[PDB]
């Protein structure tokens, strides 16, 4: 019965192949009484026929004719205790965009159905080992909980795979992986100063009337510590579950692992940017010699050495197919030690001439305007990329 | 603290089976655990050793590990040789070139020197592993970097000196600075052994 605005829904009651055997009558209720060796029932509630919520209580008895704790009546899914551990990233590809991790899976739930007797055995656990859920499942005729790598890529190496079984009916899995994972979320326009996610979605192949995540067990540090350090550091990290829809329809569980990293930012400081503002700097300084047929040749040769200071940090730059921060930093930088090269020109036909006065004002207003161009363009890179 | 690093190469093997059925009891020596191979090697193995242990398993209870582990460190003669001798050649040449009296001249070879610098880097380009991080020998050839850019600075001060008509004061700064870049190497290479080698 609806609690408030009632919209008289319909309830149906049929077989479990669809066939209909009883039908509501009008504060639904309904009755039937089966007579046949098996009798399976399945309750269908109908609202297909702009509604504000639902407010609904369903009351339902077996042998209660009077109804309005027990035991229950309607079938529960399996509740399955999930954890997950990384211990290395073996390495990151940032033109296909996936990365490599290594770690451990553990799986563990309740099943009477898959109990037994020690006295056929006279053992207390059960073995499978190198088999995965699913091969195994049809060796024994029973359903389990199969799951799969969300984007995974290629085959994985499982290790040390194995399930064992209680007489009681209680069952786990563990097995050690390592996997390549697709992550086409990639996002790196501020590189050198990116930051990135790591996502491992562990997702079950059985809809979630059958068996769905209930808890997460914390059985080892979720990111370890190894000796030295790592080209990417993690900062934070969380866990989650949710619900996806499913192929087959209805939804399935899915088991999220999420990992915040960032570069190594001393090194990008003291291997580029610390050498680039010396060969910068000299540029700047050789205005104040009062002669140009030295201050132009040292003008020309200092262009060659930022050329070949590209060639040590080849490495260092990815070759994606678009411009970065550092990509659009580098080429700022050639262009206005180019044009000095202009300038020197210019000037020394000035003093040739025999105007010398005004080829030293240039000076005066290169040595000041060239220090400003280069603080007001970092500036604007600043508030286009970092701060919206 | 590359290359100056030495390492360790572990070899574990496992038993499948708890340690009440099946538990390693003894170690057989059938042949030379390192063997002898003609010809140089890259790494070099100093000592090694062999042991057995109790490890937790996933059953419960325990089971055996068998470990070999071999101690490893580079070959010295190749880095010193290929890179810290030639590096100690240029960086000489810029100290030198502050006796000459005339800086028209010290100048230009001040600034050809610094594009030597950097085409020395492309050669040991492939000893240089690309990692994430600074090891011991990328921080050294920044600051050898520094130094040889710095002298094309005071170079230009120099001259500037000199042509406007105090070469008295430029003079004393090349007393100075034939002193005081010696000193600079010999402190940071100290400071650097402090930090990384004796804890
Ligand atoms: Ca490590
Ligand atoms: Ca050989």
Redesign the interface.
């Known amino acids: 019965e609806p609690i408030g605005e009632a919209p008289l829904p319909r309830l149906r009651l049929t077989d479990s192949g669809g066939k209909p055997l009883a039908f509501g009558l009008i504060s639904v209720e309904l009755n039937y009484t089966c007579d046949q060796d098996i009798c399976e029932l399945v309750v269908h509630v109908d609202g297909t026929d702009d509604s504000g919520e639902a407010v609904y209580r369903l009351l339902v008895g077996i042998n209660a004719p009077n109804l309005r704790v027990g035991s229950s009546v309607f079938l529960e899914s399996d509740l399955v205790t999930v954890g997950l551990a990384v211990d290395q990233i073996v390495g990151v590809d940032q033109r296909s965009e996936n990365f490599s991790v290594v770690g451990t899976l553990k799986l563990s739930w309740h099943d009477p159905k898959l109990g037994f007797s020690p006295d056929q055995c006279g053992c207390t656990?059960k073995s499978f080992?190198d088999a995965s859920i699913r091969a195994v499942a049809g060796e024994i005729n029973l359903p389990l909980p199969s799951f799969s790598f969300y984007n995974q890529q290629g085959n994985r190496w499982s290790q040390?795979q194995?399930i064992?079984v209680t007489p009681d009916g209680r069952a786990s899995y563990?097995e050690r992986f390592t996997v390549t994972l697709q992550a086409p979320d990639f996002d790196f326009l501020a590189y050198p100063f990116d930051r990135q996610k790591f996502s491992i979605k562990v997702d079950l192949a059985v809809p979630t009337n059958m068996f769905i995540f209930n808890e997460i067990e914390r059985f080892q540090q979720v990111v370890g510590d190894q000796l030295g350090?790592?080209?990417?550091v993690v900062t934070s990290y969380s866990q989650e579950i949710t619900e996806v829809p499913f192929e087959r329809g209805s939804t399935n569980s899915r088991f999220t692992t999420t990992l915040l990293v960032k570069?190594?930012l001393?090194?990008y400081i003291?291997?580029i940017f610390?050498?680039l503002f010396?060969?910068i700097?000299?540029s700047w300084?050789?205005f104040?010699?009062?002669?140009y047929g030295?201050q132009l040749?040292?003008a020309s040769?200092?262009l060659?050495?930022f050329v070949?200071?590209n060639?040590?940090i080849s490495?260092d730059l990815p070759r994606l197919g678009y411009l970065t921060v550092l990509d659009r930093f580098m080429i700022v930088s050639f262009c206005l030690t180019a044009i000095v090269v202009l300038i020197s020109v210019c000037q020394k036909r000035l003093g040739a001439v025999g105007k010398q006065a005004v080829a030293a004002q240039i000076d005066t207003w290169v040595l000041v305007i060239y220090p400003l161009v280069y603080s007001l363009y970092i500036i604007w890179v600043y508030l286009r990329f970092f701060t919206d």
Do not use: H
């Not at 350090?229 to 990417?232: D, F, I, Q």
């Not at 104040?288 to 002669?291: A, E, M, R, S, V």
């Open positions: 656990v080992e040390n194995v064992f563990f350090e790592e080209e990417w570069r190594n001393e090194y003291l291997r610390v050498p010396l060969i700097s000299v300084v050789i104040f010699l009062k002669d030295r040749e040292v040769g200092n060659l050495v070949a200071f060639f040590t490495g």
